[PDB]
Nucleic acid binder design. Structure first.
Ligand code: MG
Ligand code: MG
Ligand code: MG
Ligand code: MG
Ligand code: MG
Ligand code: MG
Ligand code: MG
Ligand code: MG
Ligand code: MG
Ligand code: MG
Ligand code: MG
Ligand code: MG
Ligand code: MG
Ligand code: MG
Ligand code: MG
Ligand code: MG
Ligand code: MG
Lengths: 62, 103, 58, 89
RNA sequence: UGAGUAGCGAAAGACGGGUGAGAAUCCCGUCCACCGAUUGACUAAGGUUUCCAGAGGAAGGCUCGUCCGCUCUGGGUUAGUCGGGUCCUAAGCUGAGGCCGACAGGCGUAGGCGAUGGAUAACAGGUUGAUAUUCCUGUACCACCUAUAAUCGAUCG
RNA sequence: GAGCUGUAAGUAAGCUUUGAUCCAGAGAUUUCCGAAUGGGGAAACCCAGCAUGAGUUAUGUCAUGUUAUCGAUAUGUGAAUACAUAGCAUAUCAGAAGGCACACCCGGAGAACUGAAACAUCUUAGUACCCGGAGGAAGAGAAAGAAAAUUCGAUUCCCUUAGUAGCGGCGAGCGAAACGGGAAGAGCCCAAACCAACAAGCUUGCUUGUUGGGGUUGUAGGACACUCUAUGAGUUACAAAGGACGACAUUAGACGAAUCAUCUGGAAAGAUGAAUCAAAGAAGGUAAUAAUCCUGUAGUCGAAAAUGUUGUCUCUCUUGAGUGGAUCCUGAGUACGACGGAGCACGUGAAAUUCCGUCGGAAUCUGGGAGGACCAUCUCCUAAGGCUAAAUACUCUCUAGUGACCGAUAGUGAACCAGUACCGUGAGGGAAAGGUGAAAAGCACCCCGGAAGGGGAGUGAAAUAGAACCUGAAACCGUGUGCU
């Protein structure tokens, strides 16, 4: 997920990663503790995908 | 400025002149820790980890500037100065022998 | 209130007595309401009496 | 939106009894309204619900040893579904 | 120092049992007295977790304390019809333009604002340690949507 | 360049030589209220319209754009009135509003307490408060000047002139200037005649209004005539404006020289002895007092990037000197005067110079002013239009420093999760509170007690150093005592 810039379809991934993130935060309030693979190193990933999409219009358009 | 896999000799401590290895360095308190140097005994009580915890004997931290990294080709302590050859910077022990004592 | 060409305005100053103890007053300028020809429609506006070098009203 | 307007469930003895008559509790984000919570469990759990109810908790007061703050306000929502089975566990 | 001195902020309590390391003070019972156009039962104004459960005894309560409106941990408030907004205006207050003035600003028309009033669609019982016409049981009403077929080339105004 | 996940120990999973976390430059994100600007409004909230789109069989919902007021630019339309103008309707534009350290400056408006031993002219003072507009500096500024000898020369600021000349109920008290010595040193663009088009009246005439070009001063410059010169200077702060070609300074960081041994000590940097670097004997830390233990210093280097100075070239631009002055122009309700008033150090007096208010009101190169009223003669200079760097005044900050400056009742109010607890309806007031040790080694265990505390044991050089913690003075409350 680090340095994956040559992917034209990432909206298949952002929606897929975000519904993954809701599968575990919702799972956090009962038990199921491995908190690294929880909202730290996964919510960074859905910020990786936007900053390599939001610039992509910018070098495209102007 | 030592690393985590060196083997040094102290200058001023409760046990001076003893050698040993370094296992941690704590680079914000800049106090390093050597095996077999300055045992500090703890009275740990019965915790949820140690079943009826008690006394023990573990060496704890001492400062950097009582510790000097000694020459490997000579075994006499030495100031370390730096120079760089080709791409990186390496440690010469300023006794004309550069050490390899990282790992 | 304001003129056109001189842009007049009452400016302060004391006024004195015969025993020379002061006060404050204003000197208001001689404004007259009149309707002049300005661009577009002729407007009615104040102007001062020493600003009389102009054609009056049309 | 519609995936992260619901935020957490709550398991309470008020609510774990209230699993029998099939009412669920949640914790939705503060700015939403009760209509588009109904349009969210349609998305996430794929059943159809009868009605929803919300309320507010005012941000009550913190400790005094831990100094004078306030715990966050929250928006507890309750959904009512008449045939959809146990979505969560 | 005054000094172990003045003061404990109206008033009827008594006994038995239980808890507890400790009880004239806390909990259960009977007996007794006290207001009763109120020390009763409800609503707004305010106050903002004081609400309930479990646990604790340093400090708070003019005494004591096992207890509490105090500390600690974990919880509690559900609305198409209930009060209000998506309706209306009074006193006022703002006020495009426009008057008016050393500056700031003052005043005012159209319009908006403003409830204590005008208009408007719901009830009876049950339930929990805490919430109710809000949730559950039965019963209807009000506004808008689609599929619904006794007429009219009648309807909205 | 090997550990990190804030201040912040504890966790529990994790990241990390494939280069983390941190340090610097650049970019994307930037919810909501705020001038708040779609309308309301009790700031952090409520209610919408307009197009697109998701969605449901639709209605409800959602999402991103969108619409305040002046102002400008474009068409529509255009009354009382017929011709047009107010007015009215659409489309673009981002000009404004608010905030600022308001410290320093510039204009508008402007007190009193106090001194005179009372007090009214005066002075506290054109000071403090209020409001308006800009800048990194603003204002002033290119002589209608100073001066009196022989003149020299724009403005500002520092030293002397000097508490002098002077003003004053001639009282209290205000208080200059030039000459001189320095700081730092640039001077220029418009108006007009006249000429070339353009339009108009209204004809080959004149006048008027624009557009260029010409031209801007007093030893009198310019228009007009005469004759002779040009791809050499000047510049993007004044003089007309934009921008590529190329050396330094900032914003991270490197390297960086020289020591041992004994003794007392819990531990040496101390004592004694033996050595060594020095462009490095500034400073701090390390178990005590270190040039040679660490971080550093002297002296050297580095910069992907992004800004600031800027050197060069490239570009824009651009003719400058003389004579005749026989004619023509030189800033109009202006300068001045009368009347009340402010400023000039100067209180209306013998009162020039300067601006405002009202009212009368000139001449033009034989002119017009000014030399402390005014007239005469003589010297100086040309108002009624503009623009301008440097010397100089300030620090809420930023960078690097220094101090016969304080060391917790001092220093800022504020070393300490300060304009906070707290008092006030409000505007606004406004505290107290630093120190275990070298290191948490923070007292395992045994005993009385419900616990709190306590006696042993134990860590530590020291717990008579026990987290109300270094040192522990006085008031004051106590314990058995020698004399009484
Ligand atoms: Mg008595
Ligand atoms: Mg009893
Ligand atoms: Mg209330
Ligand atoms: Mg008590
Ligand atoms: Mg409580
Ligand atoms: Mg009205
Ligand atoms: Mg940590
Ligand atoms: Mg708004
Ligand atoms: Mg639509
Ligand atoms: Mg010079
Ligand atoms: Mg170094
Ligand atoms: Mg060194
Ligand atoms: Mg006069
Ligand atoms: Mg002290
Ligand atoms: Mg505090
Ligand atoms: Mg010991
Ligand atoms: Mg004593």
């Amino acid at each position: 997920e680090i340095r994956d810039l040559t992917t034209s379809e990432i909206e298949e991934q952002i929606k897929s990663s975000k519904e993954e993130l809701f599968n575990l935060r919702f799972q956090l309030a009962t038990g199921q503790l491995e908190e690294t693979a929880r909202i730290r190193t996964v919510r960074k990933t859905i910020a990786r995908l936007k900053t390599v999409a939001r610039e992509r219009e910018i070098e495209q358009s102007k | 400025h030592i690393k985590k896999g060196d083997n040094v000799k102290v200058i001023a401590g409760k046990d001076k002149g003893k050698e040993g290895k370094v296992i941690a360095t704590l680079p914000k308190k800049d106090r390093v820790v050597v095996e077999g140097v300055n045992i500090m005994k703890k009275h740990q009580k019965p915790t949820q980890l140690n079943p009826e915890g008690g006394i023990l004997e573990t060496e704890a931290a001492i400062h950097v500037s009582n510790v000097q990294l000694l020459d490997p080709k000579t075994n006499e302590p030495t100031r370390v100065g730096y120079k760089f050859v080709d791409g990186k910077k390496v440690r010469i022990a300023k006794k004309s022998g550069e050490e390899i004592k990282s790992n | 209130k304001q003129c056109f060409v001189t842009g007049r305005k009452a400016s302060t100053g004391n006024r004195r007595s015969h025993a020379l103890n002061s006060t404050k007053r204003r000197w208001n300028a001689n404004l007259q309401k009149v309707r002049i020809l300005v661009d577009g429609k002729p407007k009615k506006v104040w102007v001062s009496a020493r600003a009389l070098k102009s054609g009056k009203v049309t | 939106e519609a995936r992260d307007i619901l935020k957490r469930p709550v398991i309470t003895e008020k609510s774990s009894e209230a699993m029998a008559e099939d009412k669920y509790t949640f914790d939705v984000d503060t700015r939403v309204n009760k209509t588009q919570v109904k349009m969210a469990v349609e998305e996430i759990f794929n059943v159809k619900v009868a009605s929803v109810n919300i309320m507010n908790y005012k941000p009550k007061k913190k400790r005094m040893g831990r100094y004078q703050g306030y715990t966050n306000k929250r928006r507890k929502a309750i959904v009512t579904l008449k045939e959809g089975s146990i979505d969560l566990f």
